[PDB]
């Protein structure tokens, strides 16, 4: 067979919305 | 004699306050009940209408007893011996005996109703000089009982719950600390917990006229970073792997993973699932602020050769290399460039759920939401389970009803990995006790031979292996590595979240008027 | 609002007491 | 089993 976990790659969180951060001034 | 001392200390502490008659203590011992260990039960009641409702907290004491032996099981090839711990002896008979004792304590079935609100095992001896531990246990039991009462009867008793609307007139902040040398965090019993990354969420206050500055700390979270083997197959005539719509170098074969180990309040008196959701939101927001999670590996690389050296990946990168590389003389950007060639630019969010402990009652909701649909016959639309409903309701209530508009009802929220993780501690060479969870993939790469690494990864990844086989393999590897000088205390299970659900939750929190300003992020 | 959260969501036994 | 104990 083939070693490794294939489902773990698809569950990664890449980026989130930028509106959660407080705006300067 | 452990039950008597603990009960005496609790009663002595309570004798001076105004809550003398609010608690009932029940002692259960094997000489009259079918229980494996001596236990103490702390009970409290609440009255709605003309009915009484009682809730109890169970505290078995196992200090001074012999450890459990191994059990022989049935396998595909033959018979295997599986290790066991204290929690394995708490079956339905124990629950029935505890319920019978609780009912006998209050007077009978006609005097009210009784339910179990939590369970925690105490592995340390209790003497006549342990007032602090007794006070902490009493506080934890009271918090659990009050939270259960609120959850069950808030609508009838008019008891509110935390939500993001109470932080509208203030400025939340966050901070992160990377520490890996010295003592670690401790639990209520006093056992070490791995605390490689610590995140604190606070609130900023300024006086209107006097211009004074102060802050209020709410909750804290601890965890660490692990690695998972996940090679990419280009030879199957498939498209290239895209992360955030960007291709990756062909040499990347490892996926970073974040594991949460604990969460506790700092100045808040009550800890509810809503507070846990707030802490999770804060941790997610902080950890993604400019790739701040790689700072842990960058800092770990500054120590040089050691069990946590990230330079062991040089052997993966080049087969000719046979020794870990030393990166203590490289700049931060050089280390980042080196890491970019072997690691995926993404993070996996996971959590360890203990089978028993101080906050197991709170954290048991995550496993309950893994099963979405009950197989009951339906007229038109399939029925949805109760744990999923509870988790969805908590998520929607924290964000004031925006999660429902952002996320579709019925989509997955939690996945199960199927790995059972042991809990314990061992003696470190620096004179302190360290968490048994220090043994990970990097430790095997830096300390052991590639065969052990392959066996560890196969045990963590193979799908044609039962739970007992994986447990036996990991136990054998740990015993061989540590020469048998360690102690086990319990079990834990690992679950991970859905990234789409997390993104929807972040968007809903942003849409509710909640913002956070990290204060410690560098570069 | 956040200043008196312990009054709104109170518990009988508190871990911290102060001097 | 512990999660469904009580």
Author numbering:
A (entry chain C): 591 to 615
B (entry chain A): 64 to 586
C (entry chain B): 45 to 63
D (entry chain D): 626 to 631
Kindly provide excerpts from the paper associated with this entry.
Here we find that the bacteriophage nuclear shell assembles primarily from one protein, which we name chimallin (ChmA). We find that the shell is primarily composed of a single protein, chimallin, which self-assembles through its extended N and C termini into a closed compartment.
Thus, together with our findings on 201phi2-1 and Goslar, these data show that despite extremely low sequence conservation, chimallin proteins from divergent jumbo phages exhibit high structural conservation at both the level of an individual protomer and overall nuclear shell architecture.
